[PDB]
Amino acid sequence: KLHKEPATLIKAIDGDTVKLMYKGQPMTFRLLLVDTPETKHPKKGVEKYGPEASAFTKKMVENAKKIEVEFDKGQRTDKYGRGLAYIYADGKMVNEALVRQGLAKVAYVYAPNNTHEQHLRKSEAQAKKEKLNIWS
């Protein structure tokens, strides 16, 4: 079964990436299953809603009492050495919060790292139905 573990915020970096202190080590985490517009996109420069998705992830992790990370069933780090996880701020999943506001799209999903896929597609269909941000 998946389980939540404690972590401490070091720094929010982009809408889809945050640096955390996890088991005493600084680590960069990539939020599982979501694609946000980027401020640090390697090719196209600062995409539309990239500032907004960055500010939303930033305000959510910085105002949290407790941050928790939840790894999925498969690999826990990507090829860049980033941890792949669902991140929770006071019990609310940041990955879902972004999708529900139309500040993220559900990514191309890779099994077995796909446990919350259906939960996120449901929130994306609601943000699209409400014509929010990305979907306006």
Curated annotation (Swiss-Prot):
Source organism per UniProt: Staphylococcus aureus
Q: Where is the active site?
A: R30, E38, R82
In the complete protein, the residues contained here run 88 to 223 of 231
What segment(s) does the record annotate as region Disordered?
A: 116-136
Compositional bias per record (Basic and acidic residues), positions renumbered to this chain: 116-132
As for subcellular location, the record says: Secreted
Q: What is this protein called?
A: Nuclease A
Q: Locate the residues binding Ca(2+).
A: D16, D35, T36
Its domain of life reads: Bacteria
